[PDB]
Amino acid sequence: PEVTQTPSHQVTQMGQEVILRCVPISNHLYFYWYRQILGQKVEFLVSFYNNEISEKSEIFDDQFSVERPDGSNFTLKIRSTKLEDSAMYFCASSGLAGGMDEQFFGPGTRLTVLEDLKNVFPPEVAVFEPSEAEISHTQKATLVCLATGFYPDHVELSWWVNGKEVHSGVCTDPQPLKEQPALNDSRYALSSRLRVSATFWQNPRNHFRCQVQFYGLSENDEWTQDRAKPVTQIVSAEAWGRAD
Amino acid sequence: LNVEQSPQSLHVQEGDSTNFTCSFPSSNFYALHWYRWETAKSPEALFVMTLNGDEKKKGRISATLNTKEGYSYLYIKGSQPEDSATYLCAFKAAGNKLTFGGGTRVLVKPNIQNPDPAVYQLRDSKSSDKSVCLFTDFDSQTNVSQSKDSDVYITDKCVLDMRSMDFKSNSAVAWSNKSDFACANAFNNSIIPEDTFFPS
Amino acid sequence: GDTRPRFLEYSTSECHFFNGTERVRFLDRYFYNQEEYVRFDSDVGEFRAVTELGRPDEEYWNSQKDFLEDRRAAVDTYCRHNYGVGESFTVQRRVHPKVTVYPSKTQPLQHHNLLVCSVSGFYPGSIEVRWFRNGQEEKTGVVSTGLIHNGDWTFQTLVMLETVPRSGEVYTCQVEHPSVTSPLTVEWRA
Amino acid sequence: EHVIIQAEFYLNPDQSGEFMFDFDGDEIFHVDMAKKETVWRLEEFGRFASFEAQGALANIAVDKANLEIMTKRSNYTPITNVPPEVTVLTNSPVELREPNVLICFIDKFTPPVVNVTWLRNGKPVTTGVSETVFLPREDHLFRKFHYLPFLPSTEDVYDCRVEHWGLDEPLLKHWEFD
């Protein structure tokens, strides 16, 4: 019983039209859109009920639009993106037409609005094998994954052991760091660690993989540079078990 | 029109209690909502408060409502690591739109047992590209200060839990693309305890 | 005019106040084409179908605990709240009645005529109008139109008296109203 | 003893809706469905109190949805027209030359749709003209008031022409000086 939002993240050029799609809870009566600019408060945009706009933000209408095409989907359309449209877009729904209940929020779409797509770069992903010293001292093995040089911010790092995603023994930086912190178009770096028992790491029939999902250029975006189009992609690095 | 939350950020040691406040208009009141917002998750409702003087409990989380004064208090008793989230309060007037506060970002500092602080050097990815230093197994009191040097990169502390093992640990990572960079000098700006193990 | 069928959805949310706000009875009523089908009475505490038309709503609305709770709290959050919001210009609204005394027709002495007492532009509705022949109250021959609502927070009344007047006669009209400390008296003589 | 009523309706196919607050048979305010603003009965009430028009607009939206559901539920049973009673009266006792107001009170009718025009010597008047919205009643029928400020004269006759679907032809209520 949840609200779903696609895509997770989106990169768009300034001035272009964007469509944030959403799937409210099936039997819900009221549908909403909220947005949050980084470091700012979650702000209301629009509410919708029985095929009509109920309340709208003082900004909305002059810029945005909503549509309810079928009894399953709800969408938000930004006519012409601006640098100030860079926010996390939340979709919500509530069951009662009276409003005396909670609003269920979607996971949100991270929209990044850029002046130019030229500075978009996918990450480089590398895995650093555990220190033999660490093994000899703690009988534990820490693998380190680094995702570097990506632009813009927000990638999803995951660890896979023998084809299965692992969450135990894992920790990833909640926020990435800037490579050239002076620059405003500065690329990012993100790290993560996976810790296992020395026995587990020493078994050579154990495969370790680090995956980074990057959200970049779209199917219909323009690309004129010599380097590979920085499209949405999964970049990965791997490590095998060493008996040592 | 306006909702304010205090404090903006908050640190609490595992097991300890904390609380934070929400201020909303004292006019045209219909409801006050509290939402829990974890990092990559969606904001999930904790409470919908409508009656003045009511106290609601959802396990270790309590909420109070005072409509006349225009305030709400959220209480977290025996704080657990899973309680780390941004707590947002929203005010509802006659319509359905919610007016949100700035939130209270809660960081529950975990209890670290068996602290063996150490700085290791992992074997570089084929080969070499960069050198990686790992500061692991330190106590929650040890603060990881920034790089200081522009050529070196240092990430803030991070807690990993081996659920099966019931073991929790801190870690920070240091890296640099050549040449003088090494383990001993890696975490200079940070307060490294004298007990910190260095393998030679 | 237009002969197309009409469909009307009407709803009332009633707040009945007894002894100030000491006792409050609340009612949320739903009508379809003049027919009340479902209601919530604070004295019942839940939604009850009035007709067969209300049946689905009765079971559906009582199954919605957030909505049902809004109704159980209405006596305070809604009724008493709203009572206090307007109390000073509503329960406390006091408008002075303007009093005029005149004969209806230009009929000569010793013959019948109707003595009109016009009480106008007053608030609230409660008013006592009394006719006096020669200091003594006349209970008979008093024709009232009753209380007339002007639909603008003012009332009016025409209290007429059947009169066969004499040369010495002194007719006096008394107006007792909440907005007046000293009762108003207007006199007419032949 | 006091009664506070929140009266709301929605009518099809007219697509006409109404939201009002009533205190002891008098209107406090209503929400204008065109302007989407609160219209206070006496200007002073807007100085002593507030209202968020949105609460009323949200309720009208629901009444509109509920009308669609109740129509289907009743097997499309239409409303029976109840024609109105019309009374013409004055604000205060009439006196030649001193300004007065003609009150046209339309009562005990349903649906709440009425075409009301003021006639002076058979011709229509709109000068200084005001009206109320549809007011509630204990019997669930409606009330309406129309106002005409006028200068009493012996040379003038007035009429209030009322049109309701429950009336065979338009009802006229006469007034003249006497």
């Binding site: - | 219909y30 | 709503d57 919605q64 | 609460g55 949200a58």
Partner: peptide, 13 residues
Amino acid sequence: RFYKTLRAEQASQ
């Protein structure tokens, strides 16, 4: 102060 609306709910379908 504010006159509060008693909020209406959608009927059963």
